[model samples]
Target: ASMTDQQAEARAFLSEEMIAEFKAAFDMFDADGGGDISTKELGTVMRMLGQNPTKEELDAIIEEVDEDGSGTIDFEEFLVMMVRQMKEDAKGKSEEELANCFRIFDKNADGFIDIEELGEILRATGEHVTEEDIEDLMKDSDKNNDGRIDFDEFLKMMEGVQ
Candidate 1:
């Protein structure tokens, strides 16, 4: 029995703010308050997350996250799914699709997402990430401190988020 890098990497993100965000998103979709979201609820989560997978795409994603064959996404499954998809899916996306993800958050056609803009999307996602958390995320990924995020920065941050 050994831990793959993937296994070790899972749920390694537990900063106070990051944890809050994770819980927030989980709570919103876990409308039953049973601490899980079904594949159906997962679709809503992803849609709110600004990526609308096709039926096939969503089904594939559902399969990936439904570890233990439980047919529902617990917090661990959901967070791991977010990490896995951000790492794998972002790479496989067409240039257009990848850029589309950035555009969803960018909003101003400036090719950058400012603190205010980023805050807007991050909060609206039903996640509990605070402004301070995002500020830290920007501080790490924004690189240039120009008060915004470019796609490369976004890509890196997304991968690291979980």
Candidate 2:
């Protein structure tokens, strides 16, 4: 199948830095001097990534990623792997970037956030802010209205904002 908008969105989480890393890995792994990986060349690179792809695993992935049935991986197929790898890159490149921003507001170092920290965050974003000024803003998002935010609650709150 050709690219779908959903696939495009999935790919959008990839960064320029990630693309460079992907390109280098693809270049280094494609043993035929072609643009993509084949059956045999998947090992060393997989080893570096801490993945030792079995022959069956490599073939299976290629079956899914080799869109044109060209008997080898192509550049876009390279991207497909990268996207899957990005999603697998631990934090997941595609969990939506806003979640990462929430981690920044947790300034108290207690792993949970309070309105004062949130006020400071609003201030940093150039909105005039004070604990009282933003306390109301947290009413809907504070979940328990306990004046605190943790990553879990923040994710749930973000769903409303999104």
Candidate 3:
């Protein structure tokens, strides 16, 4: 609430360098220097980026961002799309990091981490947890009570904490 959505979103998924690069690209798309990209100019930009969408597709794409229906995309609109694109890209990296963490817990080289592995992991953190405490902790993630946590279950557990 302390900041506008634009400021929050831009800072979340973008660096200063990335913002500057996008601004330059946006300016290039503004063919007549009108400070916004028209449909025709957008078409050119899309093709240049190797995406040869049809006119109908382009119009639909512009409509998605042309919030004011101005038939053009301003810098703010461009920034929103940029943030969304970056966020989508970041999800893959997050999954990779989570998988790496899962591998650390699955020390037995098995595909799943059972109650014993979970206990070992917690004990390694120097926590003085008991068998029941470990079982209770595993209960939250072992959804099917199959006595183990697979990658899917681990991912869900990770997301739950967030």
Global lDDT scores for all candidate models: 0.72, 0.65, 0.74
Compose the digit string of candidate 1's lDDT tens values, residues 40-153: 778677666554557786788777766678778676666665665565556667555767889889998798988888888888989899989878777888877887889888
TM agreement with the true structure for every prediction: 0.44, 0.50, 0.59
For model 2, residues 29-81, the per-residue Cα lDDT tens digits are 67577776774555455556544455666777767766676666655555655
Q: Whose lDDT is higher: candidate 1's or candidate 2's?
A: 1
Q: What is the C-alpha lDDT profile of model 3 across 34-124, one tens digit per residue?
A: 8788755776754553344567766776777666767787666556655544565568679999999999999986999988888898888
- The regions of model 1 sitting more than 4 angstroms off are 1-8, 13-16, 51-54, 65-70, 89-162
Clashing pairs in model 2, backbone N/Cα/C closer than 3 A: none
Q: Say which candidate scores most in TM-score.
A: 3
Model 3, residue pairs in steric clash: none
What CA RMSD would candidate 2 show? 6.1
Ranking by lDDT: 3, 1, 2
Which scores greater on TM-score, model 2 or model 3?
3
Candidate 1: deviation at residue 103, Å? 20
